C-alpha cells in the first residue's frame, strides 16, 4: 500500500554564506511542498493535517535534503541554488559549530554507508509522517502511514542489501541526529530574524512564525 518505487519517484521528481543559505532554504521550501504531495496518501489527508505535518518537520526534511546531495562535496555543503558553502566560509560567518555537525553527523555518515535516494526517501517520509505533531486530527492514520513506510524500508534493505543485516537500524539511527540538527537550525534562523541583518524571503518568514 506504500511502495518504495513511488517514494523514490518523489525524490527524483524534485531535482555572504548565511544570506545565501536563507535564500536556498526559501526556494527549497517550495520544492518540499511538492515532494510531499508525491508521497503516497499524503494528499488524502485533511488539509489542516498536511499543514501541521510539513510545518513541524521542514527544518529537518530540508537538512536531510541538503545533507545527502552534499555527499560529493568535501568539507562543505552544496546548496539547492547550486552554490557551495565551504566549512571555512561557515566559521567565518559565525555559524561554524552547527555547520561542522552537519558535516560530521549527517553528510559524513550518508557517505560511509553510501545512502541512496530510496533510503533517503523513506527516511524523509518517516520524518514527514510523525504522529507526535501537535494539533493533528487523526494521529493514528499518520502513525499507520509511518508504519507502512519503515515496514517498506526494512524490506527494501533486506532484498537490496542482504550483506548488511543492520542496514535498517543504521538508517533509523540517523533520525535522532537530525532532530538535533533541525532544532539547532531553527534556534539560529530565529535569531537571524530578530536582528534583521539577513534578508529572509516570504515563504521562509511564514515557517518562522
Amino acid at each position: 500500500d506504500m511502495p518504495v518505487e513511488k517514494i523514490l519517484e518523489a525524490e527524483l521528481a524534485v531535482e555572504d554564506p548565511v544570506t545565501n543559505i536563507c535564500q536556498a532554504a526559501d526556494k527549497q521550501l517550495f520544492t518540499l511542498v511538492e515532494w510531499a504531495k508525491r508521497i503516497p496518501h499524503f494528499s488524502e489527508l485533511p488539509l489542516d493535517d498536511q499543514v501541521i505535518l510539513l510545518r513541524a518537520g521542514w527544518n529537518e526534511l530540508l537538512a536531510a535534503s541538503a545533507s545527502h546531495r552534499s555527499i560529493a562535496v568535501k568539507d562543505g555543503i552544496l546548496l539547492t541554488t547550486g552554490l557551495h558553502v565551504h566549512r571555512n566560509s561557515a566559521h567565518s560567518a559565525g555559524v561554524g559549530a552547527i555547520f561542522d555537525r552537519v558535516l560530521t553527523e549527517l553528510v559524513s555518515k550518508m557517505r560511509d554507508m553510501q545512502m541512496d535516494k530510496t533510503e533517503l526517501g523513506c527516511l524523509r517520509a518517516i520524518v514527514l509522517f510523525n504522529p507526535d505533531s501537535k494539533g493533528l486530527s487523526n494521529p493514528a492514520e499518520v502513525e499507520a502511514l509511518r508504519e507502512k513506510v519503515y515496514a517498506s524500508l526494512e524490506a527494501y534493505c533486506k532484498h537490496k542489501y542482504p550483506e548488511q543485516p543492520g542496514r535498517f537500524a543504521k538508517l533509523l539511527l540517523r533520525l535522532p541526529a537530525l532532530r538535533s540538527i533541525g532544532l539547532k537550525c531553527l534556534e539560529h534562523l530565529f535569531f537571524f530574524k530578530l536582528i534583521g541583518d539577513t534578508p529572509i524571503d516570504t515563504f521562509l518568514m511564514e515557517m518562522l512564525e
Binding site: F30, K37, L47, V51, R55, E206, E209
Partner: peptide, 11 residues
C-alpha cells in the same frame, strides 16, 4: 493563517 502553505497545497 499560513497563506503561502495553504495556497501551495491546493492548486
Amino acid at each position: 493563517k499560513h497563506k503561502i502553505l495553504h495556497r501551495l497545497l491546493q492548486d
